[PDB]
Symmetry: C2
Subunit: 218 residues, 2 copies
């Protein structure tokens, strides 16, 4: 909509072809036809494809070319992604508490407050991003950048291929999630680690229930 | 040595420039000087770079060109990756036991036996791969393909940027790992889930100790 480079544009263009469904999973990407459609040379397009192969969205095979993977995320896949996120979060908190690391709780407070702010402003995309950044801060408490990057990739896939953000169209759900995030921050700051972990688990369980309620009656 | 296509050749050359350390992380790749060093044109080399972007080794930042990521893994980063792997494995076993799935234990037995076979043949690369596939089978018990793909990327980075395979140059370490894998299989088959989980933890702890002992 408001691009600054030819590469990212093409990337975004291709990405939207993956989201609106103009390219179906298991389809071989016609790199030559795609470059003609965008009016671009193959140097940007190729680059885009490479990036989307790094994100697991496209798979290149030695026998065919680049193939597009099944990337659409229904409720069950959303819950699988959330289970991955939650094992990462719980293990992060457990490791930090066991080894006595210093948790950047001020950054976590800032992230929770950004959640509060975007919920007050009714900025849904920024609220989703802020919720994700709060979770990422929790995970970074493990001091494992590999895990942070993995969960960032998961968040990217959720944002671009799930309707999970629609859950936060409810002000009630947004405020409950903000309250849970603040409770987690407070328990961590007070040192009640097991209570914080069970609060994290409760948060994820309720959001899983709501993810399944998204599919039942939207 | 013994290349069959010019791309795979150029790629490999560039890839070793990443492994021997002649190209520093976060450095911008001089595609023209690299292509002239290899005596090749630009179209193949870029493909190579593209391939290394598809594997997460190189990133196309918003600035024009390609930048190389911090991919070398020392002992501490190896242990970080292994902690991630073991979090996945333990959660997989716990989830399978809690929801009462049927774990494909015959596939697990086959993978453990391939470990045994490659250890017998002193095939280090295939033994490393077989160990990784045994772990991946354990993780697939979670019925979560995303986690399998994540740990596959971890194993790729380990194979190409770690010395962790040198650990298995010891026949004793290989046999201990094989015995532990078989014990995990048997405990899973007998339903002793907590014992299987503590055996998994012990295996990872011993291999973590061995990662630091590698001088």
């Amino acid at each position: 909509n408001k691009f600054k480079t030819l590469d990212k544009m093409v990337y975004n263009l291709l990405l939207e072809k993956i989201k609106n469904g103009e390219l179906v999973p298991n389809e071989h990407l016609a790199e030559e036809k795609l470059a003609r459609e965008f009016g671009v040379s193959r140097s940007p397009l190729r680059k885009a494809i490479a990036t989307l192969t790094a994100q697991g969205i496209v798979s290149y095979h030695e026998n065919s070319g680049a193939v597009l993977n099944d990337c659409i995320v229904d409720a069950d896949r959303y819950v699988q992604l959330m289970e991955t996120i939650e094992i990462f979060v719980d293990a992060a908190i457990a490791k930090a508490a066991h080894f006595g690391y210093e948790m950047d709780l001020e950054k976590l407070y800032a992230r929770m407050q950004e959640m509060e702010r975007f919920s007050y402003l009714t900025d849904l995309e920024n609220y989703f991003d802020a919720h994700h950044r709060f979770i990422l801060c929790l995970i970074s408490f493990a001091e494992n950048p590999y895990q942070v990057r993995i969960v960032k990739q998961i968040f990217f896939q959720m944002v671009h291929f799930s309707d999970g953000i629609n859950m936060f169209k409810s002000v009630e759900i947004r405020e409950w999630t903000n309250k849970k995030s603040n409770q987690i921050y407070e328990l961590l700051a007070e040192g009640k680690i097991e209570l914080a972990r069970k609060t994290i688990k409760s948060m994820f369980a309720e959001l899983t229930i709501q993810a399944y309620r998204l599919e039942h009656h939207h």
